Amino acid sequence: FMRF
Amino acid sequence: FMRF
Amino acid sequence: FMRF
Amino acid sequence: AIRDVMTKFAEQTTMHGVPKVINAKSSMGRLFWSLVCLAAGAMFCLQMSEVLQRYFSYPKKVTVEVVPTPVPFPSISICNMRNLDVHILNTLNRMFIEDDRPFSNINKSEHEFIRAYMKKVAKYAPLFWNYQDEYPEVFQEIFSRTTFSANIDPEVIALAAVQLEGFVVNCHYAGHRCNKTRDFYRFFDPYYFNCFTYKAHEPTDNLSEGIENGWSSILLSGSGMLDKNDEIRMLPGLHEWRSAVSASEGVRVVIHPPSTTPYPFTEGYDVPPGFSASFGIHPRRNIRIGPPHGNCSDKNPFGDGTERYRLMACQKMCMQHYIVETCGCADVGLPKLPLQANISWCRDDDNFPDECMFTASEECLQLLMQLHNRIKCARSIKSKITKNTTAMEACNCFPPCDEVSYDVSYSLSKWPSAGYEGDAAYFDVFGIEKFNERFNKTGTQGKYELFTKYFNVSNREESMKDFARLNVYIADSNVVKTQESEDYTRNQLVSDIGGQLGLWVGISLITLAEVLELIIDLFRL
Amino acid sequence: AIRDVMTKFAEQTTMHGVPKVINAKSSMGRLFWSLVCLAAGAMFCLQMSEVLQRYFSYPKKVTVEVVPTPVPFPSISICNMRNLDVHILNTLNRMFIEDDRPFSNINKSEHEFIRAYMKKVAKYAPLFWNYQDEYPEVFQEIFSRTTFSANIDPEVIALAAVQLEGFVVNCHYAGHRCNKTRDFYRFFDPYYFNCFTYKAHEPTDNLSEGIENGWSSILLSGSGMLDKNDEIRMLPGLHEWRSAVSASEGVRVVIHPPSTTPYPFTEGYDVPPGFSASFGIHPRRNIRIGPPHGNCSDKNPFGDGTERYRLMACQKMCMQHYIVETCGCADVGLPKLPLQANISWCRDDDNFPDECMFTASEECLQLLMQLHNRIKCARSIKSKITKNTTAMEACNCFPPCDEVSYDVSYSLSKWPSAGYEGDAAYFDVFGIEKFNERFNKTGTQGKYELFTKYFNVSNREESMKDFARLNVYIADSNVVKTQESEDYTRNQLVSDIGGQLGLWVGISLITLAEVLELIIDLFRL
Amino acid sequence: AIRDVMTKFAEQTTMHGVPKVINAKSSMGRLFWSLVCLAAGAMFCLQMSEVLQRYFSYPKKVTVEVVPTPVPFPSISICNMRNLDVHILNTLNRMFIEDDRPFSNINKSEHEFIRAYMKKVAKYAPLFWNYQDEYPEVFQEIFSRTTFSANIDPEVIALAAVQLEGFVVNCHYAGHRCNKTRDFYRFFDPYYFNCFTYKAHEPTDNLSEGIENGWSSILLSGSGMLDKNDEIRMLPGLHEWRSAVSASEGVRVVIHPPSTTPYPFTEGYDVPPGFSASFGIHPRRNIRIGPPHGNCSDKNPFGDGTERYRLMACQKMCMQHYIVETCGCADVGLPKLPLQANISWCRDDDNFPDECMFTASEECLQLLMQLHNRIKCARSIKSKITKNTTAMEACNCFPPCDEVSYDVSYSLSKWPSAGYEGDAAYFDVFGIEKFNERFNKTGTQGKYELFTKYFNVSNREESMKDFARLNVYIADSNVVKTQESEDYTRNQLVSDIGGQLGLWVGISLITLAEVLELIIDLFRL
Ligand SMILES: *[C@@H]1O[C@H](CO)[C@@H](O[C@@H]2O[C@H](CO)[C@@H](O)[C@H](O)[C@H]2NC(C)=O)[C@H](O)[C@H]1NC(C)=O
Ligand SMILES: *[C@@H]1O[C@H](CO)[C@@H](O[C@@H]2O[C@H](CO)[C@@H](O)[C@H](O)[C@H]2NC(C)=O)[C@H](O)[C@H]1NC(C)=O
Ligand SMILES: *[C@@H]1O[C@H](CO)[C@@H](O[C@@H]2O[C@H](CO)[C@@H](O)[C@H](O)[C@H]2NC(C)=O)[C@H](O)[C@H]1NC(C)=O
Ligand SMILES: *[C@@H]1O[C@H](CO)[C@@H](O[C@@H]2O[C@H](CO)[C@@H](O)[C@H](O)[C@H]2NC(C)=O)[C@H](O)[C@H]1NC(C)=O
Ligand SMILES: *[C@@H]1O[C@H](CO)[C@@H](O[C@@H]2O[C@H](CO)[C@@H](O)[C@H](O)[C@H]2NC(C)=O)[C@H](O)[C@H]1NC(C)=O
Ligand SMILES: *[C@@H]1O[C@H](CO)[C@@H](O[C@@H]2O[C@H](CO)[C@@H](O)[C@H](O)[C@H]2NC(C)=O)[C@H](O)[C@H]1NC(C)=O
Ligand SMILES: *[C@@H]1O[C@H](CO)[C@@H](O)[C@H](O)[C@H]1NC(C)=O
Ligand SMILES: *[C@@H]1O[C@H](CO)[C@@H](O)[C@H](O)[C@H]1NC(C)=O
Ligand SMILES: *[C@@H]1O[C@H](CO)[C@@H](O)[C@H](O)[C@H]1NC(C)=O
Ligand SMILES: *[C@@H]1O[C@H](CO)[C@@H](O)[C@H](O)[C@H]1NC(C)=O
Ligand SMILES: *[C@@H]1O[C@H](CO)[C@@H](O)[C@H](O)[C@H]1NC(C)=O
Ligand SMILES: *[C@@H]1O[C@H](CO)[C@@H](O)[C@H](O)[C@H]1NC(C)=O
Ligand SMILES: *[C@@H]1O[C@H](CO)[C@@H](O)[C@H](O)[C@H]1NC(C)=O
Ligand SMILES: *[C@@H]1O[C@H](CO)[C@@H](O)[C@H](O)[C@H]1NC(C)=O
Ligand SMILES: *[C@@H]1O[C@H](CO)[C@@H](O)[C@H](O)[C@H]1NC(C)=O
């Protein structure tokens, strides 16, 4: 999961 | 002050 | 002296 | 009296064969002389066939020579490969590190670009959180630089893009210091954002320093002041996913004729940070001829005529024409046609509802896919159209009739040398020029602190690698001129016709007047 | 009746001087007119001498112009400057670290290349242990890459050389992703071992991404994953002792016409790891004329005719011809002649007995020196023969009659930028493309572990420096065409002869028929 | 008898119109034939006007072709961008670290250059201590390299500048090792100090090694052995303040014709340390024609004639001429005119009294400002004069009549590869060639200790970055020849005149003899  |  |  | 009038002609005529045919006593002699005349005529006709074929092919004659007439110094356009300012980038990164929800960050800053950026990103946040593992490529395409360029006012982007005072440390041309606010002209590029064109200024200045035979400048181009995240985070608007220039560090340098628009995305040279680049210019001049002998144009068919003509502009606007015709939208990577301006960009996303800021609904996903499809249409047309000779020839793009071009020698050296000379360079940048103190202002103090920490004396050997120097000079003063000219003029045609006509039959036009007089006499027979 | 027949001629003739000479009343007039005729004739003869000298010199006329007809996209050949795979190299190093006797390592591995390599090295181990201080240069010459290339089956070397799936991370051409197994063609080079030629594929694909106006690829070219030994150890087959390309890191890039064999050892451009290289192609086309006006050939005198002709191939095979003639053996650095193939390489060492694997006898040392002498013979011929104009002209190597050539702009940028864009690039390589998972296979697991350790997220700023990006595009769509043509045609010769003959004497061929008729009349006198 | 003599002419003449005008029976016929004759004459006159305009414009004809005749291998001149030797620089730095007063350091060393350097600096020490905050730019200008070059004997500077044995590690040309003391020729440049020109040596040598098709050399060019000061200190004579090449690390490489003087400050290519540079030469030859058709010269108007002519030298000496005329002094950056040599350099400072070594008096400050003003005068003339077409054309600088030129492909690779091949390269430099042991001499022991510490086996991965390799080779064996020739010869003029005269009026010179005979008969009327 990639966050901003 | 700059030295040699 | 150089080794392989 | 046909025989009598022909005999009178044969008594007073300059033709070589007719008197011998008419006054022939032996029938064998008459046959022989008729054959001689026919052979001469046929040979003349064949030679004239070849001569007129050569003439009506309209050949060209080309000379290549070096001339002493000097060209003006070319326009130099410099683009930082990083689109946004370092302090703005760090502020964005830190803001996402404190709150990863872009919606809550809309009102966290007074900077206009930051508010617009947060509002634009917030329209995609639920979709990115719910579908990044199903459609990674779509989100990489949509968070590219060009979408922010297409959807945010360039006058707002310019407040956050690279600034001239923070980009050009020093500039010298023709033995005197440059006046940055006078000699650099800012223009906006959809990928590089802020770019600057240098226009040469000759000595009138009392600031006698620098290179005498060209242009030299020191540019801050590195990215080493940016925060190093412990895990990979999405920062939209920075990376042009899988573009050939994407994620690169350095300066894009374009050498082009003075009053011309540069196209840094497809022309120019690259320079890495920490290096000194030497550009040795060899000027060229090409002169061309018009429709019967070739094709050349003095103006762009698609333009308003303010620019000095280059074929590249015509071809790019032809591509834009076909893209607009097929996809119904314009590409940001090409100029918008001066005909119509109500044409929307293909990457426009003002259609997105504000509910997409709160929910990852199917309508929002379908709109995302539709934007992706528009981008794909534009890319497909861009890739295919230039191979299509019919479409390209329909645009009537021809090379300029009087073109100045440059051949550039390219070489690199590690600019800030280790040791004492590097100390001298650092003192020149930060002690004499006082680069940091440009930012000691109420509106730029954060950047001042950042540069004060990064560029301290102890860390100079590493920090100076973020600078690059450009050295642009004319290598050969003489211009290599390639000039077209018509190879076979009408005078040359007349002379060759005279040679052939004298060799074979011996007719002159005064003798054609003999035959005309005989024709009128036969009318009076 | 000689005077009477000449008078009859003078009464009816078109010659300008003869009637005045014949009908001259004053002797002074006859002398004057004879002198006039002689002067006219002599001047005509001199002018014809110059004219015919110009014609029989067979001059050429050359035009340089830009044309809209497009060239096909060139073939791009990429060679990794490292010849062997990183995992194979580490395995060899570790195997020698556990047992420095190559003989005992012959049966330690199931890899074919490793067994062949160990067997080849074992023939030299006692000599290297007993004489490395007396003949260091001999052992450096013999443990070079080219000896392993000459003495190990290339189909066995290909199992250990750089693989396409481990070399090309991404590829894009004309707006769509490349199909690596379809578009890349592997060929073997005696110095670079595995090399790959890209052949362009136009849109038909649904993978709409990448550069639209050219070719771009990301290549793993660095050597930073290799073990760092605490002391220097001999690893044969890696270093081409004192070659101009020896011990270098990066990619060798060759831009050449589509159906042509590349020669990376003497043509192409260099690219360092950690940089993005831009190649701006300006296409050229040269058209030439045959034997009387020049020299050009459409085929290679030494070849089978399957290749598209380039002068470089002809010159290289001429060099190989002379090397084979003098030394009695062929050089691996040049093509083997399609005539004979029973010719042995100069670096062949199958003569070495198996007792040399156990003893450093004088016979083994003499064989070592004989191999060294063969290498020296080949090198001496290579160095001398190209200065010998007689030998080079005897091979009848002429430039192609219709040649396509490319002028390439070259520039570099530091590709993986520090900070956020570098994070995006890393995620593109390892998150989206999933480069490491190519090696998650039973036959390549060790390399998978190596890359998993080396390319972890924390070490990205250093590890990404092992990649390099190539950006190859056509800078100017129009082709600069240089065309030879014959300057002085036979028609131009005829026209100039007519001009001269009309100016001086006024003869036409119909008047030469006058003189012929007079000659026949004198035969009937 | 005017009518009778004209009738006799009309009875026996070859002119086409005059007999018809004279023997005309109808007055209308006479008018018609007079009009025909006048029209033919006028058309002939117009065509001759165009023909003679073309001839007296003296056009040129240019052919571009590839020829097999080979050029000799070019002269290669290499300059280290660092002017002084590393041990000398470290000695100077340490001497100032122990005593910052240059006056007390005059007698601290037996090296001649050090004593001269200390004496020169001591003349400025009180001024620098008292005014560095008021006039930093003046002291940066005066402590530049070029002032020491202008004011210290070059035979003394050569003892401290970079030495050949400490600069060139290895050299190979045409398959054999170079003989450094035989093939390299040292020359002095006011900015680079010591520079070396390589002159090719063909095989006669028994040292069969290296590149066969060109020239390759390994050069020590980095500055990483120099001490890293904890604060910035003034070291005069090292930094050319705000020059376009100032504070750079690498090698300056100039490829020029054999017997020519190189000008590294304005021509050549850059190479950074730690990289391998490939130079692919494409030779060119230009042949030109003299005054009526063009301008070309075989000798330099300002020179003694020992050099092979290049236009660059003529232009530089023209610039020096105008600088000497205006400022009354010569620039060290340009050749001194072989006419006069009593001309002083603009940067000369022998006027400075010895009291300036003790006091910062107003006289010393005024002398400092006067030297600054002289430098500014020279720089202003250098910047302005080349734009002044009158002054540049007054020097009669024309391109050579037979010129050999080179187009060079440029590319870089990271030379010392990480890992095993880097180990092999290190062993080649330090184990086989034994680079350090060159300095194991009584006069160079300190440098031996420095290199022994810096280049130890453990630190090889970092220390090898100070080396750079040059690979210079001829890419295409055939020479691209551009030859001027006269387009419209006198013979072509005569032939075209004959064609025109035959076409319109039908006159031959034998008929002009008719009219001359008639004129003499009228004199005898
Ligand atoms: C750079 O150039 C600008 C003009 O292009 C200079 O600004 C001018 O300064 C003069 C006084 O010297 C004023 O009379 C003008 O009104 C100014 N013009 C503008 C547009 O501001 C500026 O001083 C120059 N800067 C330097 C450092 O020389
Ligand atoms: C100038 O450009 C025109 C393009 O309109 C050329 O005309 C074309 O020539 C090609 C052959 O080269 C034909 O296949 C096309 O049908 C032509 N198009 C038209 C509209 O006629 C023309 O030949 C060019 N002239 C020169 C001298 O190069
Ligand atoms: C890359 O191209 C190859 C062909 O060059 C593709 O393999 C073919 O796949 C089709 C089905 O799509 C089969 O019918 C053919 O028999 C295959 N040919 C070969 C030689 O294997 C391959 O699918 C392509 N790969 C990608 C990722 O598109
Ligand atoms: C084409 O190549 C031939 C090479 O065989 C040239 O002939 C040679 O010309 C040189 C002078 O340039 C003479 O020294 C040789 O003796 C010639 N060799 C032979 C076998 O005749 C020929 O001149 C070339 N033609 C053109 C038009 O360039
Ligand atoms: C490099 O060349 C020089 C000459 O240019 C060589 O020195 C000569 O050596 C021979 C004996 O071999 C003497 O007879 C000459 O008097 C020497 N000449 C000079 C000027 O010293 C030198 O030996 C060569 N070096 C190498 C390593 O080959
Ligand atoms: C050769 O160079 C001379 C320079 O002296 C040229 O003469 C000059 O031509 C320019 C026009 O191009 C005139 O403005 C100058 O007045 C001329 N100078 C003199 C002293 O006459 C000459 O034209 C050149 N010749 C060629 C064939 O290029
Ligand atoms: C070339 O362009 C024309 C006009 O846009 C189009 O009609 C034609 O189909 C194109 N050619 C191909 C092969 O698609
Ligand atoms: C920065 O500005 C402040 C006043 O706002 C001043 O006190 C300080 O000395 C300045 N610093 C520099 C380095 O100019
Ligand atoms: C200089 O800056 C570096 C980082 O840029 C920092 O690590 C170091 O402590 C600083 N040194 C001083 C003396 O401020
Ligand atoms: C040039 O080559 C020919 C044929 O190989 C040979 O006979 C001749 O000796 C060579 N020239 C020289 C100077 O060795
Ligand atoms: C590698 O393959 C194994 C099965 O052989 C699998 O369990 C594992 O998840 C794979 N890892 C990756 C990163 O694909
Ligand atoms: C990442 O790899 C480096 C070496 O490649 C290693 O030193 C480091 O410990 C690794 N970090 C993690 C978190 O695995
Ligand atoms: C050009 O040079 C001449 C001679 O040096 C000089 O007289 C003239 O003033 C110069 N031109 C200008 C514009 O100063
Ligand atoms: C250096 O020279 C000394 C004698 O002056 C010698 O003892 C020593 O072995 C030499 N060292 C090397 C590495 O050649
Ligand atoms: C090698 O040299 C480096 C500095 O050049 C030094 O730090 C290191 O201790 C040295 N190692 C040995 C084994 O001498």
Author numbering:
A (entry chain E), B (entry chain F), C (entry chain D): 609 to 612
D (entry chain B), E (entry chain A), F (entry chain C): 2 to 205, 209 to 529
Text lifted from the article:
Here we dissected the structural basis for neuropeptide-gated activity of a neuropeptide-gated DEG/ENaC, FMRFamide-gated sodium channel 1 (FaNaC1) from the annelid worm Malacoceros fuliginosus, using cryo-electron microscopy. We solved high-resolution structures of FaNaC1 alone, with full agonist FMRFa, with partial agonist ASSFVRIa, and with both FMRFa and pore-blocker diminazene, identifying the ligand-binding site and elucidating the conformational changes induced by ligand binding. Each subunit comprises a minimal N terminus and a nonresolved 63-amino acid C terminus facing the intracellular side, two transmembrane segments (TM1 and TM2), and a large extracellular domain. The FaNaC1 structures presented here capture a ligand-free resting state, two ligand-bound desensitized states and a ligand-bound dilated channel state.
Preparations of FaNaC1 alone and with FMRFa (30 μM) yielded 3D reconstructions with a global resolution of 2.7 and 2.5 Å, respectively. In the FaNaC1/FMRFa structure, we observed a discrete cryo-EM density in a small pocket at the upper corner of each subunit, which fits a single FMRFa molecule. The FMRFa-binding pocket is formed by α-helical segments α1–α3a (residues V87 to F144), the β6–β7 loop of the same subunit (residues D234 to G241), and partly by α6 from the adjacent subunit (G423–K428). The basis for ligand recognition appears to be mostly hydrophobic interactions. The FMRFa N-terminal phenylalanine residue (F1) is positioned near the entrance to the pocket and the M2 side chain orients downward between α2-F129, β6–β7 loop-I236 and M238, and α6-F431. FMRFa R3 orients upward: the density for the guanidino moiety in our map is relatively weak, but the modeled side chain is 4–6 Å from polar side chains α1-D101 and β6–β7 loop-E235 and R237. Finally, FMRFa F4 and C-terminal amide sit deep in the pocket, with the F4 side chain surrounded as closely as 3.5–4.6 Å by the hydrophobic side chains of α1-F97, P103, α2-V122, A126 and F129, and β6–β7 loop-P240. Additionally, FMRFa M2 main chain carbonyl oxygens are 2.5–3.1 Å from the FaNaC1 α2-Q133 amide side chain, indicative of a potential polar interaction. In both ligand-bound structures, however, the channel pore appears closed, with radii of ~1 Å at the level of G503 and G506 in TM2a (G3′ and G6′ in a TM2 numbering scheme). Thus, FMRFa- and ASSFVRIa-bound channels have probably adopted a desensitized state in the prolonged presence of agonist, in accord with the large decrease in current amplitude that occurs within ~2 s of FMRFa application, especially at higher FMRFa concentrations (for example).
